[PDB]
Amino acid sequence: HLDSLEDQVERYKQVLDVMPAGVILLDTQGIVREANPEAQRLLDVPLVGEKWYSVIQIAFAPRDDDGHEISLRNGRKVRLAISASTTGQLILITDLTETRLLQSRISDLQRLSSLGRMVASLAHQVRTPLSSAMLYAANLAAPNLPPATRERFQSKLVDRLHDLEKQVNDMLLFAK
Amino acid sequence: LDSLEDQVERYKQVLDVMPAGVILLDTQGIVREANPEAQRLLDVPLVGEKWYSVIQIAFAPRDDDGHEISLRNGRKVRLAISASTTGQLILITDLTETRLLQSRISDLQRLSSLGRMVASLAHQVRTPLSSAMLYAANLAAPNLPPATRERFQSKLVDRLHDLEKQVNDMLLFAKGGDNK
């Protein structure tokens, strides 16, 4: 059927409507002839019936921090995707506003986690001396050991207790 | 007249280089269409497969999954179900990158919390260690009651475990591993 094509393109338009990505359909001249709701959302400016380059001097605000994405003047940070297509170019837009927003919060919290991350580290180190401390502690319960043998393990135990006390103090020094 | 063919190939490319997956089912629930993105995300064959069969092989839900749905590969994608004349129109978006970030923040704020409790997590850590050394030092005399000696002996082990447990509480808390 020839009408089936109308129903086919109908299901296609259906995609662009609920598609979570901007779709700008330019023309040989360079005019926005079509824009889905996601495109109008991010740009938040008149799209259809405007000049692509003109839209760039309104909803776009380039910055140095911008790499793969481009900062919109409305605050959003989006990535552009230009592809080869005859009879107008296609431009797919993605919303990475949240992406960079989350990234701009890890750097700040990365320094705040320094002290905490140091304690977490010093805590993992304690597992080593403690492991050896429990072994030498069990040797104190071993059978048939001379008097000078009990003091040997005891002497080796205090070493672990000391090496362990210096790590906890190091940890229990970051405080208040 | 011919404003369709040219408009078809135009939209035909949109789904080709689309950054989001597009799945079109029918009433029975059989996969009929699948763009390259969807294939990359799901990996397993789609074209000519029962959607419910794919859900078992492709998807792999979890409890931690809030809005998104974890896939077999581990990536977390969000499903957007939309009405359609011919079955449903399921779109797939990848939020593995976001989630990852959302998980990091928590872990960072997690470490900060431990950094503020270091003060309170002091008395709980020195108490057992101090005892271990208090008894360990006593077990170094010329000769003393054997029963009393074995009495202190039992203390140590318990003191060390109390500490061990107190230290494992920190690491487990510090490890975070939540809000993934």
Numbering used by the authors:
A (entry chain B): 12 to 187
B (entry chain A): 13 to 192
Text taken from the publication that reported this structure:
FlrB is a histidine kinase that phosphorylates FlrC, which activates Class III promoters. FlrC is phosphorylated at D54 within its receiver domain by histidine kinase FlrB, and the FlrC central domain forms a heptamer with ATPase activity that catalyzes σ54-dependent transcription. Our results demonstrate that the PAS domain controls FlrB activity and class III flagellar gene expression, and FlrB must switch between inactive and active forms in order for V. cholerae to successfully colonize the intestine.
Interestingly, although full-length FlrB was subjected to crystallization, crystals contained only FlrB aa 12–192 in the longest fragment (chain E). Three residues of the expression tag (Ser-Asn-Ala) and the first 11 N-terminal residues were disordered, and the C-terminus, including the catalytic domain CA (aa 193–351), was missing, likely due to peptide hydrolysis during crystallization. In the crystals, the FlrB12-192 fragments form an asymmetric dimer in which the two chains adopt different conformations; this can be seen if the PAS domains in each chain are superimposed. The extended helical DHp region forms two alternative kinks in the alpha helix at residue 130 in chain A and residue 125 in chain B, causing the two DHp regions to extend in opposite directions in this superimposition. This asymmetric fold has not been observed in dimer structures of other histidine kinases (HKs). The structure of the PAS domain is in good agreement (r.m.s.d. = 0.759 Å) with a further truncated FlrB PAS domain structure (aa 8–123) that was previously reported. Members of this cluster have substituted Fα and Gβ elements of the prototypical PAS structure with a unique short loop region. For example, L36 is in close proximity to R22 on the opposite monomer; the substitution of phenylalanine (L36F) may lead to a cation-π interaction that causes conformational changes between PAS and the N-terminus of the opposite monomer. H135 is C-terminal to the kink in the alpha helix in the FlrB1-192 crystal structure.
